[PDB]
Amino acid sequence: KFPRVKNWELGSITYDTLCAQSQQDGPCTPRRCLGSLVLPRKPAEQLLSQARDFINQYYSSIKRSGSQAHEERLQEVEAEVASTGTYHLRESELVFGAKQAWRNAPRCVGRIQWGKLQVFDARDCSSAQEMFTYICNHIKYATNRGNLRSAITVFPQRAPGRGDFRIWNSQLVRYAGYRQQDGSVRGDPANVEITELCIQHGWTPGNGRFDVLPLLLQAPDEAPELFVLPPELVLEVPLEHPTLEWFAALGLRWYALPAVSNMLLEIGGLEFSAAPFSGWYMSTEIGTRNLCDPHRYNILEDVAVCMDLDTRTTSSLWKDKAAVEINLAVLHSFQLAKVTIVDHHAATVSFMKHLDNEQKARGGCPADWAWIVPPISGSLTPVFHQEMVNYILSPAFRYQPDPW
Amino acid sequence: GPKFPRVKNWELGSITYDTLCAQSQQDGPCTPRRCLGSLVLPRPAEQLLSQARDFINQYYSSIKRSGSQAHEERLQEVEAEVASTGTYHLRESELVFGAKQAWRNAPRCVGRIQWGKLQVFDARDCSSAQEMFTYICNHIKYATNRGNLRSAITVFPQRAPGRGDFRIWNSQLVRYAGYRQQDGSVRGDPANVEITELCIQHGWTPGNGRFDVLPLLLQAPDEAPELFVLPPELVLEVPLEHPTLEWFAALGLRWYALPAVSNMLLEIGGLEFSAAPFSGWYMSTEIGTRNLCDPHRYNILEDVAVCMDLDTRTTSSLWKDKAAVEINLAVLHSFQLAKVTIVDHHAATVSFMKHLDNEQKARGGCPADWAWIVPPISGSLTPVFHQEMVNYILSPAFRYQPDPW
Ligand code: HEM
Ligand code: HEM
Ligand SMILES: Cc1cc(CCNCc2ccc3c(C)cc(N)nc3c2)ccc1C#N
Ligand SMILES: Cc1cc(CCNCc2ccc3c(C)cc(N)nc3c2)ccc1C#N
Ligand SMILES: C[C@H](O)[C@H](O)[C@H]1CNc2nc(N)[nH]c(=O)c2N1
Ligand SMILES: C[C@H](O)[C@H](O)[C@H]1CNc2nc(N)[nH]c(=O)c2N1
Ligand SMILES: [Zn+2]
């Protein structure tokens, strides 16, 4: 049947009926539940049916379903696909698809914002070099002297029997991670592979802990070229703690723009293999994960030491204590630097309203509970106590293999 | 590769495959098109024989006598019993085996490293509500062990064909009362309101503290539940205090030492033990974060926060976070002071990683509910956050059942 969804702090109950229109399978079956898995294990009128749907969405979107602006566009798509085994989106259909993709993304806690999205059409792109300029202008628009702005840039759709446009980096801004022969890593351990790929394509590596990587940009069926971001573009914030004055002296810093460049944007059967998008950070992304994750910069113990805590045992909650001070120093710094950012408390509160908006508009909202609940203070936020239904709506952002 | 789920740990990069879920014979909440893993409660001699046979097989396999003559004789023995009396009965050691298995098979339990060490008390002879109370008193004494807590379960008679069930009406053996106020608010534990008013409807003389231990509502077959009050010295409590905040002690917060669930059904070989309370010991965050800081429980976060002189009028002061940490600290500190068994959420999840590693070798996987295994604070600061998990129902099982009223 149709799932009962309950908030356990409030006592309220909904019914997700939007899930009924899920056309692709998630990882689960009745026998096993694989909801905690980060990545998934894995003719022509399948395309044509995917594209019919998306068009129906778009015209229902702009109130005028079943007109003939509608049904003519239906015949365009059908005709185009019938003759070429593919078709093309009109720019405004693309702006719609891009907003629907964000709206539909079960893992995003920021979809209250989903309507306010700047879409740059960059399909008139024929080279790595053009790709670079597009990206450079994405970042300046999006960074916006620190008053950040949600933005996506969309490079040419994939094509049968032609390579893909790809951005090799996982994010537009990331820090180099140089493996030390001595087991260790200087910089961000999440970026070792790509760091070396850069080096491999002739980047002159630094030896810093927060060195900004260059971009490997790749036009179809050509070697990836390498581009170095004008240092002006990369807005960084130094971290410092509003009361702990030794904190600033930890040399910690984080870039301001969260822009993801390795996912696939799927609209109406069409796949866009380079379509980087960006927003602003939630504090816990920087302060809990990027800095305290054991397989990341992993600074819990350092801070703990300067906080003169009891590292000797876990039941002193030294880790917990350290973490809170880091998250505070990240909110402090960004606020003091006037760079946009949101705390996990503010974010999940707004997501709860989004849930309510969504429930009334579409009868539901696909959400991945494990990703929607922040990495600290789990039950201290309202989304913890909220049941969620998860499913794949299209348009959709997706994971795809790395181009090497 | 393998036709089984591939499971990865993102901290260590390590990979496993769950082969044990192939023996999950009962379907859960999710389907290919919808995941329902966040839901707390998703909704004949024929059928008995199957479950029966399966369990006996598990058993003889656990004692490495699978396909032996004792094995095939047990199966005939059960078939015979089911054939005449519609039901069948477990041997002592079968029961013990099943009880430990049901614990072992429990996805939401982070304490399962210990699953092999479980005192099973057989109360299948128990024949009155009066006797239920005595067994339950006995359990609490043994399990509490003056603060050196010991895990245990007590098993009262199984559901019988056309005969009322043994039921303990209370959710736990120890629960603080919830009193609906003249205002609308609740004094004490809002969770326990319904049971609290039921105690009263059944004759309890209610107090009015924040921490009034409820009486037991104990129901023998086809009899109205009878009220039983627990002798206060049997119910060990811990006065919460903070190692450096001297004022914390003044808040008069206490919690009881023994988590003991009394309303779950225990199922083995298709046999239903409607009343089979079991107990372990607390993990720090259960008390400090859920029970004391949940908006819909004692809700003391803002109060602690105000005492801490925090900016409770901005989310970004992380005043909620600062106070949550110190409340958990106070819980840990206080139980350690009182010499009462308690495990912090760090050390607990670390033990569970070892259990996972053990279960991988022993069975080919471990059924696990990620959202219940990850602590309610400091989530990613524990190893289990970075551990993918597979959730499926194995039997023997601890199940939920409707409230008897
Ligand atoms: C405007 C401010 C935004 C905030 C505060 C925000 C917040 C978040 C957070 C906390 C996550 C979890 C990611 C993680 O823990 O690694 C996430 C993921 C995600 N967000 Fe948002 N987001 C924002 C804007 C956007 C925009 C503009 C888009 C797309 C146009 C978007 C689409 C997504 C998608 C597709 C994911 C899944 C990430 C993945 O699986 O790699 N979000 N977001
Ligand atoms: C020995 C120390 C133990 C610890 C630290 C422990 C810890 C926990 C925790 C933290 C939960 C989460 C419950 C919640 O937040 O509501 C839980 C659940 C559970 N535990 Fe354990 N536990 C222990 C012993 C046991 C024992 C002895 C049994 C059974 C014989 C057991 C069976 C279960 C079951 C069935 C659940 C699921 C609760 C539900 O589904 O409502 N646990 N445990
Ligand atoms: C290692 C890994 C990591 C991730 C991380 C998820 N993506 C991070 C992300 C992606 C987009 C964001 C956006 C759009 C905004 C924001 N504040 N944070 C965002 C954070 C996903 C898959 C894998 C894999 N494999
Ligand atoms: C109201 C409610 C509450 C719960 C709580 C789950 N049971 C709590 C529990 C049960 C057994 C435990 C055990 C055995 C040990 C321990 N440390 N904590 C334990 C905690 C589950 C479902 C519902 C519902 N509906
Ligand atoms: C294994 C686990 O599912 C995985 O680490 C998830 C858990 N929840 C998460 N939640 C968010 N927001 N981001 C993440 O990367 C993860 N990782
Ligand atoms: C809605 C959500 O599933 C609910 O709050 C769950 C989350 N995880 C939990 N985890 C544990 N251990 N205990 C709980 O009661 C819950 N509640
Ligand atoms: Zn699932």
From Swiss-Prot, chain B:
It is found in: Cell membrane; Membrane, Caveola; Cytoplasm, Cytoskeleton; Golgi apparatus. Zn(2+) binds at residues 30, 35. Heme b binds at residues 109, 400. (6R)-L-erythro-5,6,7,8-tetrahydrobiopterin binds at residues 38, 371-372, 385. Residues 34-405 are annotated as: Interaction with NOSIP. L-arginine binds at residues 172, 281-282, 286, 291. It comes from the Eukaryota. Produces nitric oxide (NO) which is implicated in vascular smooth muscle relaxation through a cGMP-mediated signal transduction pathway. NO mediates vascular endothelial growth factor (VEGF)-induced angiogenesis in coronary vessels and promotes blood clotting through the activation of platelets. Belongs to the NOS family. Homodimer. Interacts with NOSIP and NOSTRIN. Interacts with HSP90AB1. Forms a complex with ASL, ASS1 and SLC7A1; the complex regulates cell-autonomous L-arginine synthesis and citrulline recycling while channeling extracellular L-arginine to nitric oxide synthesis pathway. This is Nitric oxide synthase 3. It comes from Bos taurus. The gene is NOS3. The chain holds residues 67 to 482 of 1205 of the full protein.
